Design an enzyme around this catalytic site. Structure first.
Site, short mmCIF file in Angstrom:
data_model
loop_
_atom_site.label_atom_id
_atom_site.label_comp_id
_atom_site.label_asym_id
_atom_site.label_seq_id
_atom_site.Cartn_x
_atom_site.Cartn_y
_atom_site.Cartn_z
N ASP A 211 -17.60 3.50 19.38
CA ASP A 211 -17.37 3.58 20.83
C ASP A 211 -18.69 3.44 21.54
OD1 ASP A 211 -14.54 3.89 20.92
OD2 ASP A 211 -14.83 5.91 20.11
N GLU A 214 -17.64 4.64 26.64
CA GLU A 214 -16.46 5.25 27.25
C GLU A 214 -16.98 5.93 28.50
OE1 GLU A 214 -15.09 7.16 23.33
OE2 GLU A 214 -13.24 6.71 24.42
O1 LIG Z 1 6.65 -1.86 26.56
C1 LIG Z 1 6.60 -3.07 27.30
C2 LIG Z 1 5.92 -2.81 28.63
O2 LIG Z 1 4.57 -2.44 28.38
C3 LIG Z 1 3.92 -2.00 29.54
O3 LIG Z 1 2.59 -1.64 29.14
C4 LIG Z 1 2.40 -0.31 28.67
C5 LIG Z 1 2.75 -0.19 27.19
O4 LIG Z 1 4.13 -0.11 26.95
C6 LIG Z 1 2.16 1.09 26.57
O5 LIG Z 1 2.30 1.08 25.17
C7 LIG Z 1 0.70 1.20 26.87
O6 LIG Z 1 0.27 2.46 26.40
C8 LIG Z 1 -1.14 2.64 26.38
C9 LIG Z 1 -1.53 3.95 27.10
O7 LIG Z 1 -1.04 3.98 28.43
C10 LIG Z 1 -3.03 4.10 27.09
O8 LIG Z 1 -3.36 5.39 27.55
C11 LIG Z 1 -3.61 3.91 25.70
O9 LIG Z 1 -5.01 3.85 25.89
C12 LIG Z 1 -5.82 3.73 24.74
C13 LIG Z 1 -6.88 2.69 25.09
O10 LIG Z 1 -6.33 1.40 25.24
C14 LIG Z 1 -7.97 2.64 24.04
O11 LIG Z 1 -8.99 1.81 24.54
C15 LIG Z 1 -8.46 4.05 23.77
O12 LIG Z 1 -9.48 3.99 22.81
O13 LIG Z 1 -7.40 4.87 23.34
C16 LIG Z 1 -6.47 5.07 24.39
C17 LIG Z 1 -5.46 6.12 23.93
O14 LIG Z 1 -4.62 5.62 22.89
O15 LIG Z 1 -3.16 2.69 25.14
C18 LIG Z 1 -1.76 2.64 24.99
C19 LIG Z 1 -1.36 1.43 24.15
O16 LIG Z 1 -1.90 1.52 22.83
O17 LIG Z 1 0.57 1.22 28.26
C20 LIG Z 1 0.91 -0.01 28.81
C21 LIG Z 1 0.43 -0.07 30.28
O18 LIG Z 1 1.15 0.79 31.14
C22 LIG Z 1 3.77 -3.15 30.54
O19 LIG Z 1 3.19 -2.64 31.73
C23 LIG Z 1 5.13 -3.80 30.84
O20 LIG Z 1 4.94 -4.98 31.55
C24 LIG Z 1 5.90 -4.02 29.55
O21 LIG Z 1 7.22 -4.39 29.87
O1 LIG Z 2 -8.83 14.35 21.77
C1 LIG Z 2 -9.54 14.01 22.97
C2 LIG Z 2 -10.86 13.29 22.68
O2 LIG Z 2 -11.60 14.10 21.79
C3 LIG Z 2 -12.94 13.62 21.66
O3 LIG Z 2 -13.58 14.53 20.76
C4 LIG Z 2 -13.94 15.77 21.36
C5 LIG Z 2 -13.14 16.91 20.73
O4 LIG Z 2 -11.73 16.81 20.99
C6 LIG Z 2 -13.55 18.27 21.18
O5 LIG Z 2 -13.03 19.29 20.36
C7 LIG Z 2 -15.07 18.33 20.97
O6 LIG Z 2 -15.56 19.58 21.42
O7 LIG Z 2 -15.74 17.32 21.72
C8 LIG Z 2 -15.43 16.03 21.23
C9 LIG Z 2 -16.22 14.97 21.98
O8 LIG Z 2 -15.80 14.96 23.35
C10 LIG Z 2 -12.94 12.21 21.06
O9 LIG Z 2 -14.29 11.81 21.00
C11 LIG Z 2 -12.08 11.39 21.98
O10 LIG Z 2 -12.04 10.09 21.37
C12 LIG Z 2 -10.64 11.89 22.13
O11 LIG Z 2 -10.17 10.87 23.00
#
Ligand SMILES: OC[C@H]1O[C@@H](O[C@H]2[C@H](O)[C@@H](O)[C@H](O[C@H]3[C@H](O)[C@@H](O)[C@H](O[C@H]4[C@H](O)[C@@H](O)[C@H](O)O[C@@H]4CO)O[C@@H]3CO)O[C@@H]2CO)[C@H](O)[C@@H](O)[C@@H]1O
Ligand SMILES: OC[C@H]1O[C@@H](O[C@H]2[C@H](O)[C@@H](O)[C@H](O)O[C@@H]2CO)[C@H](O)[C@@H](O)[C@@H]1O
Ligand SMILES: *[C@@H]1O[C@H](CO)[C@@H](O[C@@H]2O[C@H](CO)[C@@H](O[C@@H]3O[C@H](CO)[C@@H](O)[C@H](O[C@H]4O[C@H](CO)[C@@H](O)[C@H](O)[C@@H]4O)[C@@H]3O)[C@H](O)[C@H]2NC(C)=O)[C@H](O)[C@H]1NC(C)=O
Ligand SMILES: *[C@@H]1O[C@H](CO)[C@@H](O)[C@H](O)[C@H]1NC(C)=O
Length: 436
Positions: A211, A214
């Site tokens: 990462d 973020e």
């Molecule tokens: O289902 C069809 C419909 O999709 C809509 O888009 C939705 C998706 O359905 C849904 O799965 C997606 O969920 C996301 C979630 O909201 C995020 O919080 C999560 O974020 C991730 C992030 O991308 C990463 O970078 C990070 O490291 O982790 C976080 C936490 O997991 O990602 C998930 C998906 O994996 O959200 C979508 C947007 O709202 C469309 O909008 C619609 O058009 C479709 O019909």
């Molecule tokens: O689960 C949320 C978030 O956690 C992040 O790790 C945290 C952890 O949950 C917490 O116990 C600790 O004290 O701090 C670390 C770092 O913030 C993790 O890095 C994230 O990816 C996850 O989204």
């Protein structure tokens, strides 16, 4: 999953640069692709829903394999549906577009192949505008050990591939993915109580995650997360661990990572609005992946960070936490930080920088995303976390946001026009992307 045909797919172009020495760079004609989970899942024949809201159709998807055969990932209207635009070297991700929230995109080498980066003994730079990212939002730019082809050569029932953003994995072993390894996630699917579009299935998709970035306008973190197997692997059920399981520590990946957030490390004046890095204006983020012997085949030993704003090159601040020294991520820093904060050392348990570096050696895919947090409201990034703890205890305070911030229904309503813009990506040898 099949390759959808209801809506056409065209990947927005995005340029980036490879540098050989400072001031000596050449342009790559890249493109980006939207992750599979954002796409409509249509039955191949009739263009009707295989998945509606957060449930699957029982005729098209009676089981995982049949679903993958009967259902296609549709093309994406990037701007109109997802709020994704590009121009030159710039990629802009809008937050709310209609009912859609954010996006997750991968950089492509070609229309069927993710761009693979070999980060060991290299430097990656990008520019970012986080000025319109408030509490609770995360514009992330990071690397994961995905397969370059999105899984197609291993999983014949994945006909969609990288062209449709298949194959995601990360250190949370995500179980929210609708298709993993050529199978749908319908057996064991449990719709989310709080997100109308999502659920959790029995299958998860694990791999190491670097990462790089973020962040929002309040705080940022840089965090490697190792896994026991560096590259993409399927897990099942609660043994997946990660944020989607009962016990985040039950699996084969470190869900927490070894993080450096300057605010959390005791310097609150460094990063934020009007601060030393002033998040009201764009800036450059440089990250270096150093090895123990300084060569391409050494072991990952240190991750360094510099910022550039108004042409001023500014190193990451030192930790001001007792027991934790320096401004970079090293084994010594990570061991000390976990001890000082009282956090479990899952980083070490899953092989630390050695296993992170092994993932880097396998090759990693660049991800750019914008999200809000249906588990923890981004409080871990920008607030006091856990919320019951004393905010003066080292490790608790990560930014200025109140502990009631970041609820998705609040931020989606109040900040729909928020966005993140990434631009001017540069990659090359150490010191080649900026004025060292
Ligand atoms: O289902 C069809 C419909 O999709 C809509 O888009 C939705 C998706 O359905 C849904 O799965 C997606 O969920 C996301 C979630 O909201 C995020 O919080 C999560 O974020 C991730 C992030 O991308 C990463 O970078 C990070 O490291 O982790 C976080 C936490 O997991 O990602 C998930 C998906 O994996 O959200 C979508 C947007 O709202 C469309 O909008 C619609 O058009 C479709 O019909
Ligand atoms: O689960 C949320 C978030 O956690 C992040 O790790 C945290 C952890 O949950 C917490 O116990 C600790 O004290 O701090 C670390 C770092 O913030 C993790 O890095 C994230 O990816 C996850 O989204
Ligand atoms: C939060 O982190 C920031 C960023 O690291 C940090 O700001 C830095 O503070 C130091 C100390 O005030 C600054 O360093 C000084 O800068 C001035 C002007 O450039 C120099 O003249 C000083 O030089 C003398 O001291 C040096 C040793 O420190 C000697 O080597 C030298 O020969 C001189 O005697 C010194 O370098 C630094 O510029 C800032 N950085 C930025 C970008 O502002 C800040 O202090 C941290 N906050 C807290 C509360 O810890
Ligand atoms: C990169 O530049 C820094 C600052 O001048 C220097 O300390 C370092 O040795 C350089 N790294 C390499 C591999 O040349």
């Amino acid at each position: 999953q099949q390759a959808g045909t209801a809506t056409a797919e065209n990947h927005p172009p995005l340029t980036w640069q490879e540098c050989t020495a400072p001031g000596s760079c050449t342009t790559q004609n890249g493109a980006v692709v939207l992750d599979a989970n954002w796409r409509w899942v249509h039955d191949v024949n009739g263009y009707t829903n295989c998945y509606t809201g957060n449930t699957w159709d029982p005729t098209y998807c009676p089981d995982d394999e049949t679903c993958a055969q009967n259902c296609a990932l549709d093309g994406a209207d990037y701007e109109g549906t997802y709020g994704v635009t590009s121009s030159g070297s710039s990629l802009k991700l809008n937050f709310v577009t209609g009912s859609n929230v954010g996006s997750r995109l991968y950089l492509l080498q070609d229309d069927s192949t993710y761009q693979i980066f070999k980060l060991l003994n290299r430097e990656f730079s990008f520019d970012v505008d986080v000025s319109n990212l408030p509490c609770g939002l995360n514009g992330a730019l990071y690397f994961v050990a995905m397969d370059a082809d999105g899984g197609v050569s291993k999983y014949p029932n994945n006909k969609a591939g990288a062209k449709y953003g298949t194959g995601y994995c990360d250190s949370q072993c995500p179980r929210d993915l609708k298709f993993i390894d050529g199978e749908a996630n319908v057996e064991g699917w449990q719709p989310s109580s709080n997100n109308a579009n999502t659920g959790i299935g029995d299958h998860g998709s694990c791999c190491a995650e670097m990462d790089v970035w973020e962040a929002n306008s309040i705080s940022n973190a840089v965090t490697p997360h190792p896994c026991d197997t560096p590259g993409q692997t399927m897990c099942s059920g609660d043994d997946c661990g990660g944020t989607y399981s009962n016990d985040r520590y039950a699996g084969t990946c470190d869900p927490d990572g070894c993080d450096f957030n300057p605010y959390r490390m005791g310097n609150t004046s460094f990063y934020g609005p009007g601060k030393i890095i002033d998040t009201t204006k764009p800036f450059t983020v440089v990250t270096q992946f150093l090895t123990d012997d300084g060569t391409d085949t050494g072991t990952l030993s240190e991750i360094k960070r510099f910022y550039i704003q108004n042409s001023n090159v500014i190193p990451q601040p030192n930790s001001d936490i007792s027991g934790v020294t320096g401004n970079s991520i090293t084994t010594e820093f990570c061991t000390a930080q976990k001890q000082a904060f009282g956090d479990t050392d899952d980083f070490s348990q899953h092989g630390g920088l050695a296993k992170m570096g092994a993932a880097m050696q396998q090759g990693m895919v660049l991800v750019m995303s914008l999200w809000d947090d249906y588990a923890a409201q981004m409080l871990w990034l920008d607030s006091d976390y856990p919320t019951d703890a004393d905010p003066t205890t080292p490790g608790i305070a990560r930014g200025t946001c109140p502990t009631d911030s970041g609820v998705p229904s609040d931020v989606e309503s109040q900040s729909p026009n928020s966005y993140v813009t990434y631009s001017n990506i540069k990659f090359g040898p150490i010191n080649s992307t900026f004025t060292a």
